[PDB]
Design a protein around this ligand. Structure first.
Ligand SMILES: O=C1N[C@H]2NC(=O)N[C@H]2N1
Ligand SMILES: O=C1N[C@H]2NC(=O)N[C@H]2N1
Ligand SMILES: O=C1N[C@H]2NC(=O)N[C@H]2N1
Ligand SMILES: O=C1N[C@H]2NC(=O)N[C@H]2N1
Lengths: 123, 123, 123, 123
């Protein structure tokens, strides 16, 4: 976990995120999305639960990226929830929720759901 | 947004979270869950997209809580994605993803999805 | 269950659905949405698991509505997954997935997620 | 669509489902799950929106399976929402919601979310 999480990860869409897993569960870094109403790097922050594991389970973690930087303001935020699996072919398997700011009338259609798999190799 | 987000919020399950929205999109605080394999306060970190809004839309945001503290280690993490609506009756409407660390065989059933509504009044 | 499910239900958005729960787990009926790219009634079909319950649990069920009828073709379909709780104030609590047909390039943003609560009284 | 949907499909977990897409949007068939609290074949019913497409988009569809048959009663139901893409390598990409019947107290943790990709070849 932690040490193994720190580094650069790539997903199936071509996005990249670099993260540092701190000793006490913190995750800090940047995310660069290959799709969307995103351009450049965005700040990301999250947490992971280690003290994960005498039965080779994954380490649960999650992070958030608000899609605003000095080049774009997409008025939305995405949260990724999943687990890290280390080893030869380590990966982070996730499901994400992307919410856009809407008027109350369109709040029912404000959230998209999807999944992403990240590897240390691209892809 | 930001100023309006800062404070204590309560949801329909009886959980409470106190957060500080920093000038540049950061969200930091603690979460205390009324249900689950949670006991006491857990650290939370997230982001919000302001610079939100000439058409009274909500402010998109998200945060993560790893369910580990000095009393419990639930080997899981939850991410909440939604938007803040201010005013007389301000609220944060969210959808969440709770992922538990599993063995590869049970990874298909590792994530729960739900929704929570937070108000400044309980509830 | 079954008998209790049969009838007209209304949700918080003003939609209405009438369903018949058949003896062997089938659910058939129509749905009329108050929002969206929907107009009039659409056919719905689903299933419920009864033989549900010596510990007052809910009955799990789900149904699908393809948003095409003789007035509109929204090129999308919604599935609702949840459980029925009977009694004085019976309700069906659900989470739904709305998928739109997209080109491969936009498939990552093809699905919306939300939740709806249905009651026998409106609302 | 329709004709192309009819047939046997296999997903990454080893499950199999055979379906018939009827002329007017109906989907009927059986599902056999390789995981879970499932054993044998279960009935499935759903809908698809064709009249799908001068820009090679997918056909939106969804179906439900209640996990009860003459060998098992798992007190749960799963709904799959996604789209069919035909061609050389046709597939059905989905996201699913599995809800279990719970007591009111555990209703917050009643639904699991995941995703499955089905192909005509296994896998
Ligand atoms: O890498 C990405 N994953 C997807 N989810 C999201 O929010 N934007 C897309 N980019
Ligand atoms: O407040 C809570 N909301 C629910 N989601 C979650 O992760 N635990 C529960 N507690
Ligand atoms: O009643 C409705 N619920 C929401 N989900 C959906 O698919 N359309 C909306 N209408
Ligand atoms: O094929 C399967 N997909 C998964 N979702 C589900 O409900 N059970 C599992 N089996």
């Amino acid at each position: 976990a932690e040490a193994g999480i720190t580094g650069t990860w790539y997903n199936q869409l071509g996005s990249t995120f670099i993260v540092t897993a701190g000793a006490d569960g913190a995750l800090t870094g940047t995310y660069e999305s290959a799709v969307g109403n995103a351009e450049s790097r965005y700040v990301l922050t999250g947490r992971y639960d280690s003290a994960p594991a005498t039965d080779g389970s994954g380490t649960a973690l999650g992070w958030t990226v608000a899609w605003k930087n000095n080049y774009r303001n997409a008025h939305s935020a995405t949260t990724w929830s999943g687990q890290y699996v280390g080893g030869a072919e380590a990966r982070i398997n996730t499901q994400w929720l992307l919410t856009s700011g809407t008027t109350e009338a369109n709040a029912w259609k404000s959230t998209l759901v999807g999944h992403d798999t990240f590897t240390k190799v691209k892809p």
